[PDB]
Structure formats: structure tokens, C-alpha cells
Amino acid sequence: DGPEKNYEKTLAILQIESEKAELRLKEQEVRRLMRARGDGPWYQFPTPEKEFIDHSPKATPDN
Amino acid sequence: DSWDKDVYPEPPSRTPAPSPQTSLPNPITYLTKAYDLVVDWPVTLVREFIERQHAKNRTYYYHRQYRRVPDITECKEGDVLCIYEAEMQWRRDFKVDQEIMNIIQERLKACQQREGENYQQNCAKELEQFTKVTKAYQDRYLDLGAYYSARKCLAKQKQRMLEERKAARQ
């Protein structure tokens, strides 16, 4: 087919691989930041459930 | 002849006229006449037949030319697209420079064989051209290594220019 086919295919491959490398580095940074200070979706460690707390009036008023 | 004297220079031949003092016949002249009449005539006949067949079936081919992509000096680091384009252009120019050196060396060898006993005097300009192009080739391409590249060539040129500028300070 000629040299331009291989040339532009190589350009497309290089663009894909460079984008993948940048995405992997960004993913590493995102994971590190979330694990250090969990405020995104990931690394959300559990917490006791709020809905299982009694709020009805009880025997002792000092609650 | 597909070649041209602009890139393959050749001085015009100066052959002397024969001055046979002896009365003996020249066996070289006899053999060259017989050789022409026996060998050269049928060979040029079949070559003319081949040439007229090619003229009947004539085709053409062209020499590919590449436009100048932007140099690696204006390519941002980590931008592998323009870096790839500049690297391919640099490899192309490297191959062209290899063939330029081959042309100069072949020209020098032709000068030496043509002059023979006078090559130490009559090939002064050919040797000067060979020396200058060798010095330029060493300044641009030497000591790059097996993984030679546009980046390495640029780093070598920057180092050489820095040394020259520092020497030009004093």
C-alpha cells in the first residue's frame, strides 16, 4: 500500500500508547491521593450504621 | 549513461596520436579490429534490439521527495508524535549523508586512479573536499553510539556549541 499507511498507523499507535502511559501515571497519583486522604469514591473505609440508633425517649432522661 | 559530470567529475582524456617508428605491424591494432568485427557488432546489434523493445514498452518512474516536517528543536519533550516525525526525518538525512560520504570517497578514489603517479599533487582539491566533508561528518555524527538519534545529535551539537562559545569568551 505504500509508506504513508505504515507511517500514519505508527502515529496512531504512538498516540494510543502515550495516552495510556499518561492515564496510568494519573491513576497512580489518584490512588495515592485517595489512600492518603480518602475523599473520593475509592478507599472509603466503613463506619457503624447510623440507622440502628435509638432515638425514642428512654427510662433515663439524661441521654 | 545515467550519471552526470556535475556529481561525478572527470577531466577530458588527452590521448596522444600513434607514431609508430617500427615497421612491424601492431598485433594490438589487429586484435582490436578483429575483436570489434567479431564481438562488438553482434553485441551492439542485440543491444539495439533490446533498446527498441524497451522503446515499444516504455515506462517511467519518479524520485520521491519528502516535505520538511518541523525539526526536533521545536518538538516538545514527551510529545512522541512530532518526536517520531523528526526522528524519521533525521534518520532519512543520516542515510543521505552516508551516501554523500560514499560519493565523495568514490570521487577521491577515481582521482587517485586517474592521476596515478601524480596523485600527491593533482588530487589536492579532491583530498581537501574529502577532508572538509569528513570534518563536518565527524562534527555532526561521530561518537553518537549504536542508538544514534536526533536527540543525541542535538545534545552533541549543543555541547560542541557550548564549548566553542566558552572558548570564544577568551
Core attributes:
part of a larger assembly, 2 chains, A: rod-shaped, B: 170 residues, mainly alpha, 0% strand, electron transport
Helicity level of chain B = 55-70%
Helical content of chain A (DSSP H or I, runs of 4+)? 40-55%
Radius of gyration of chain B: 26 Å
Euclidean distance between termini CA atoms of chain B: 55 Å
Give the structural class of chain A: mainly alpha
Biggest pleated-sheet summary of chain A: none
Distance between the termini of chain A: 83 Å
Specify the number of helices of chain A.
1
Rg of chain A, alpha carbons: 27 Å
Strand segment tally of chain B? 0
Specify the overall morphology of chain A: rod-shaped
| Subunit organisation of the chains | part of a larger assembly
Q: Name the pair of protein chains with the most residues at their interface, and give those residue counts.
A: A-B, 7 and 6 residues
Strand content of chain B: under 5%
> How would you describe the shape of chain B?
flat
What is the strand content of chain A? under 5%
The assigned structural class of chain B equals mainly alpha
Note the total helix count of chain B.
Answer: 5
Profile the largest sheet of chain B: none
Structure description:
This is part of a larger assembly, with chains A (63 residues) and B (170 residues). Chain A has 63 residues and is an all-alpha fold. Chain A has one helix at 3-36. Chain A is rod-shaped and about 90 Å long. Chain A starts with a helix and ends in a 27-residue tail after the last helix. The radius of gyration of chain B is 26 Å and the shape is flat. Chain B starts with 26 loop residues before the first helix and ends with a helix. Chain B has helices at residues 27-56, 80-115, 119-122, 124-141, 150-169. Chain B has 5 helices and no strands. By secondary structure, chain B is mainly alpha-helical. Chain B: Residues 1-25 are annotated as: Disordered. Chain B: Keywords: Electron transport, Membrane, Mitochondrion, Mitochondrion inner membrane, Phosphoprotein, Respiratory chain, Transport. Chain B: Residues 9-19 have a biased composition (Pro residues). Chain B: InterPro entries: NADH_UbQ_OxRdtase_su10, NDUFB10.
